[PDB]
């Protein structure tokens, strides 16, 4: 009926107070266009959507998205050129994501213009946007240049090139930033003669601008331009601009070159890399700002293996290793951890002998670093050098560092290494332990600071949780049982504490046979505090069923049952039975 | 207290659900209209 | 006396049930819309 | 893909929420419209016929939907494709699903070409008529009157005999359906078949072995009588109707009583005089009370449709003593049903005959112990008023109104105050002012309080009917002199009357004649009157104006606020709170 004319339906859906019910109306605009057909979609729907709509961000974004898909619903590509006016309105609005969704939709329906009508209606749109009063139109136009250039006549290719040149010399920094970003995207559709003629001058002009925001985005496009030029003329044009960009007084630009450095290297090949690009890497690692240093440090391994193999090793040793030697003792806890993440991969690149002579002092230095990220990032990449050096040659060279910061004066340091002991035992392996470590874990148990002893009993628990009840029974359990029964009565208590936490991982048979007889022998000891914790200890074991021997536990438990001892024993016997 | 703080939470829940409820209801209102709109359009296309 | 604590609970349960029902009813409604869309596209072609 | 209008429907029917499947069936037109017309007939309707099972509401929605599908299957030329599934739904056990399927069948019957009627519809009627389970036969009964008129004579005969076999069925459950559709079917039959086959089935079903079928046949009798020409009515209908009027189920005698005026103005006045009048008398003396209730309930209109020549004679000779003994009936519903209509016999007997014979019955009806008999006698008073004049009417009302107004009892005096306004609205004000206002005053000084409240609120109604100035004339002088009374209860009653009259008489009347009196009572010795003066001033206040209020009311409420009586203080300040501050 008259109230079902899809235009009237859309109208009465648009007078809603709620925005979610207008959003869900515009999100299903496909249905309105499909119900109107293709004759009335052009006759009345697109005129409606072009001028009339003034609503919030959320709605206009969906409208741009919908106009992006209306090609079939409008009559096919012979009539696609009428989706342009409303998307043009949307390409100038104040909210930025709506502008960019409209530009994305315009580039999408660009491919649907046949060159004949592409020249006719789609290019005058890009012109109008590039010449608009307020700059939002001009940023949108910057988005629209790359898509339509290639399939258009040569004269209008020249005209578009001129309009883009005009946009790069714009007054407002916002337009200049936009064009600087789209510079590479435009260069990809230009003929090589025009890339040298027109693109490289605009490139050098933007990279030598007053604002840093644009210089930043022109050195970004530098990697696309360098990939479009042959290595020979590449040196003359691109390298002045690049070298002055690496020495720019704004750390943002130097950060951008450090970031896109592993890509710039592959772009300019391995010759110019060896010549001018490696020293720029060196003074970027010696940069005055820390956040540039970290970005450069992340790019060391990606840079080293991507070198000319003949000169790669000589240059790595002479030119890059001293800078690491000083970067390991940097001041910022982020540069250090960033280089710690990737410095391990330099080991298959240098060989076993060179790694031992020149890389092992650096990894051992960054192992003793106080920052937890540096230590963890070093340990996380230990297989990288484990396969290059060998488990023996590796364990034998870090053991001194483990024992160094194991007997370090600061209790914080000793706790820091007890923390990382089990994951550093994940890559050292079941073997290549024992030696003087096990001894380190026991010396941990006799420590003065209580936090160290607590973390070390809870460390033995996880350290048999990774090797096995068999391993624990073979090497740890004897050292533990040996401590029960000794002059300093506190060590007996710590023996029983670790026995308590140890029974939580071994099956009944191994826990029973060897932990009960010496817990009861050391339980016969005169001191009341040792027996007191004996009772508390047999309480927590209990739970590991012992049933047949549980009773044999209840009878000596009654025998022991000085007031504190009795409290603990009675509470244990009540809870167990 | 402890029993009156929970009642305010419950009231807040019922308030939120009520707001959402209305929207969903009069969203279905539009949806049925759209089916009607399509029905009519199909009815015309056969002629 | 805080029997109101149980009636408010019943109200919340009812509202949650209705929310569930209406949502998975809207599902069927959208399906009908697509069905009519498809029928119209085919009738439009030939 | 999965948007196929049948796959969609299967998935819709698989959902568990019953309301979801219901909303699926309710909008089944959308599915068929998607399918079109070729695929609708070919694919959808077989899927609906053989295999569709659900709760009764869904089945009923489907039966509803199928009635409108005529266009969705190809116009009339193909409407018969709707017949299979509906027949399934006409055999369901549930009564409402069956009845809606029958509804849709009768609806799409008229969208059949007579050729299609014989081809597909009538065979379905025969199928349903000969079903093993009674639901089929009951459903079949309703389908006869729609297909008979446009089908050949031979099929007309077949239908007639199938219907005959339904009226003689062994199940009362379908004999009842046959008796229901008997008149609806006779209205489409040729006159010689209603004399030939309808009348015998009417006589057989009207004397069946079940009360239900008998009452249903005597229901479908009023249609039968209006199809024969008068003389034939007598020989045929009257033996059956006579037999019904003495049926042994009181429900059937009630049926005869309730349809009575329709039977007299269908059967013709002559044979009403011959047979209905004596049967009417025998129905007014009926053992079961509800029959007497319906018979008395239909007296005025029965006598209004009698033969114009003998009305008076017959009314006086045989009808009136039955009403004279129905006035003294035992049941209270019989008495009240009579009282609602005994009025309409005054315009029929004319002034003199109404005065002599109807006035005794009317007064005796007014003397009944009921809030329903008395109320019904006074409610409808204008028809007898304009027949017997206002004077001669009130000539025989005061010696009854006064007898109840000043009655020894307690409930009786209150009982007649409720209907004092409407007795006075109609029936003249000039009547009221002479004798009937002394009773409305004496009401207010009654020992019991309930009567006094009734009269005080009565006053408002009387000023609603008669006007502001009538109240100024007769009520206010007698209400203010009540204030001068040694008993303080009556001094209080003056305040209550003044405030119920303060909402009707406007600002002028209330300010001049009632505010000076209300302010004088503020001085009263008894504390009750004083705090009630404060309450009454609070009630009057709103209708007053500010200048008189702040000048005369506020100072007196202030003087009451210091009273060394806690109640006077409370109510004086509640007044001052609502009014002054």
UniProtKB/Swiss-Prot annotation, chain B:
Disulfide bonds: none annotated. It comes from the Eukaryota. It is found in: Cytoplasm; Membrane. Residues 3-47 form a coiled coil. Belongs to the WD repeat striatin family. Tetramerizes. Part of the core of STRIPAK complexes composed of PP2A catalytic and scaffolding subunits, the striatins (PP2A regulatory subunits), the striatin-associated proteins MOB4, STRIP1 and STRIP2, PDCD10 and members of the STE20 kinases, such as STK24 and STK26. The STRIPAK complex can be extended by adapter proteins such as SLMAP:SIKE1 or CTTNBP2NL. Interacts with CDC42BPB. Calmodulin-binding scaffolding protein which is the center of the striatin-interacting phosphatase and kinase (STRIPAK) complexes. STRIPAK complexes have critical roles in protein (de)phosphorylation and are regulators of multiple signaling pathways including Hippo, MAPK, nuclear receptor and cytoskeleton remodeling. Different types of STRIPAK complexes are involved in a variety of biological processes such as cell growth, differentiation, apoptosis, metabolism and immune regulation. This is Striatin-3. It comes from Homo sapiens.
Curated annotation (Swiss-Prot), chain D:
Keywords: Acetylation, Cell membrane, Cell projection, Centromere, Chromosome, Chromosome partition, Cytoplasm, Disease variant, Host-virus interaction, Intellectual disability, Membrane, Nucleus, Repeat. PROSITE patterns: HEAT_REPEAT. This is Serine/threonine-protein phosphatase 2A 65 kDa regulatory subunit A alpha isoform. It comes from the Eukaryota. The PR65 subunit of protein phosphatase 2A serves as a scaffolding molecule to coordinate the assembly of the catalytic subunit and a variable regulatory B subunit. Upon interaction with GNA12 promotes dephosphorylation of microtubule associated protein TAU/MAPT. Required for proper chromosome segregation and for centromeric localization of SGO1 in mitosis. Together with RACK1 adapter, mediates dephosphorylation of AKT1 at 'Ser-473', preventing AKT1 activation and AKT-mTOR signaling pathway. Dephosphorylation of AKT1 is essential for regulatory T-cells (Treg) homeostasis and stability. Residues 393-581 are annotated as: PP2A subunit C binding. Belongs to the phosphatase 2A regulatory subunit A family. Gene3D superfamilies: Leucine-rich Repeat Variant. The lineage of its organism: Eukaryota, Metazoa, Chordata, Craniata, Vertebrata. Each HEAT repeat appears to consist of two alpha helices joined by a hydrophilic region, the intrarepeat loop. The repeat units may be arranged laterally to form a rod-like structure. HEAT repeats lie at residues 1-39, 40-77, 78-116, 117-154, 155-193, 194-232, 233-271, 272-314, 315-353, 354-392, 393-431, 432-470, 471-509, 510-548, 549-581. GO terms for biological process: chromosome segregation; female meiotic nuclear division; intracellular signal transduction; meiotic sister chromatid cohesion, centromeric; meiotic spindle elongation; mitotic sister chromatid separation; negative regulation of hippo signaling; negative regulation of phosphatidylinositol 3-kinase/protein kinase B signal transduction. One of its GO terms (cellular component) is FAR/SIN/STRIPAK complex. It is linked to Houge-Janssens syndrome 2: An autosomal dominant disorder characterized by global developmental delay, hypotonia, variably impaired intellectual development, poor speech, and dysmorphic facial features. Some patients may develop seizures. Residues 40-314 are annotated as: Polyoma small and medium T antigens Binding. GO terms for molecular function: protein antigen binding; protein heterodimerization activity; protein phosphatase regulator activity; protein serine/threonine phosphatase activity. Residues 78-232 are annotated as: SV40 small T antigen binding. It is found in: Cytoplasm; Nucleus; Chromosome; Chromosome, Centromere. Pfam families: HEAT (PF02985), HEAT_2 (PF13646), PPP2R1A-like_HEAT (PF22646).
């Amino acid at each position: 009926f008259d109230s079902l004319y899809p235009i009237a339906v859309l109208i009465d859906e648009l007078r809603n107070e709620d925005v979610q019910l207008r959003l869900n109306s515009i999100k299903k605009l496909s249905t309105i266009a499909l119900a109107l057909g293709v004759e009335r979609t052009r006759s009345e729907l697109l005129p409606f959507l072009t001028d009339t709509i003034y609503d919030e961000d959320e709605v206009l974004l969906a409208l741009a998205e919908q106009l992006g898909t209306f090609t079939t619903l409008v009559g096919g590509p012979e009539y696609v050129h009428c989706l342009l006016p409303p998307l043009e309105s949307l390409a100038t609005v104040e909210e930025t994501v709506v502008r960019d969704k409209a530009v994305e939709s315009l580039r999408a329906i660009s491919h649907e213009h046949s060159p004949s009508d592409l020249e006719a209606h789609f290019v005058p749109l890009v012109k109008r946007l590039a010449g608009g009063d307020w700059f939002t139109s001009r940023t949108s136009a910057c988005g629209l240049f790359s898509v339509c250039y290639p399939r258009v006549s040569s004269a209008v290719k020249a005209e578009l090139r001129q309009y883009f040149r005009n946009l790069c010399s714009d007054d407002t920094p916002m337009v200049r930033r936009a064009a600087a970003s789209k510079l590479g995207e435009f260069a990809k559709v230009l003929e090589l003669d025009n890339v040298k003629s027109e693109i490289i001058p605009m490139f050098s002009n933007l990279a030598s601008d007053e604002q840093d925001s644009v210089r930043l985005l022109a050195v970004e496009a530098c990697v696309n331009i360098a990939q479009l030029l042959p290595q020979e003329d590449l040196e003359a044009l691109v390298m002045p601009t690049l070298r002055q960009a690496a020495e720019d007084k704004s750390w943002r630009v130097r950060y951008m070159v450090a970031d896109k450095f592993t890509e710039l290297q592959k772009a300019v090949g391995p010759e110019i890399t060896k010549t001018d690009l490696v020293p720029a890497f060196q003074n970027l690692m010696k940069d005055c700002e820390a956040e540039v240093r970290a970005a450069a440090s992340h790019k060391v391994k990606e840079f080293c293996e991507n070198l000319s193999a003949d000169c790669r090793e000589n240059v790595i040793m002479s030119q890059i290793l001293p800078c690491i030697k000083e970067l390991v003792s940097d001041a910022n806890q982020h540069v250090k951890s960033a280089l710690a993440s990737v410095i391990m991969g330099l080991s298959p690149i240098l060989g076993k002998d060179n790694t031992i002579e020149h890389l092992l002092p650096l990894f051992l230095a960054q192992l003793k670093d106080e920052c937890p990220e540096v230590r963890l990032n070093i340990i996380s990449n230990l297989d990288c050098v484990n396969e290059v050096i060998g488990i023996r040659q590796l364990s034998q060279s870090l053991l001194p560092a483990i024992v160094e910061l194991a007997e370090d004066a600061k209790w914080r340091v000793r706790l820091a290494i007890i923390e990382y002991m089990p994951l550093l035992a994940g890559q050292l392996g079941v073997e290549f332990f024992d030696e003087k470590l096990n001894s380190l874990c026991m010396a941990w148990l006799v420590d003065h600071v209580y936090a160290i002893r607590e973390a070390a009993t809870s460390n033995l628990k996880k350290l048999v949780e990774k090797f096995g009840k068999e391993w624990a029974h073979a090497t740890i359990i004897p050292k533990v049982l040996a401590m029960s029964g000794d002059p300093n009565y506190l060590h007996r208590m710590t023996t029983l504490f670790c026995i308590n936490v140890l029974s939580e991982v071994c099956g009944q048979d191994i826990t029973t046979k060897h932990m009960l007889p010496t817990v009861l022998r050391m339980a016969g000891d005169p001191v009341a505090n040792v027996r007191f914790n004996v009772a508390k200890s047999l309480q927590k074991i209990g739970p590991i069923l012992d049933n047949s021997t549980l009773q044999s536990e209840v009878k000596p438990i009654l025998e022991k049952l000085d007031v504190d001892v009795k409290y603990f024993a009675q509470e244990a016997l009540t809870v167990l039975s | 207290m402890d029993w009156e703080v929970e009642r305010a939470e419950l009231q807040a829940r019922i308030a939120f659900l009520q707001g959402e409820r209305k929207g969903q209801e009069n969203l279905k209102k539009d949806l049925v209209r759209r089916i009607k709109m399509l029905e009519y359009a199909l009815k015309q296309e056969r002629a």
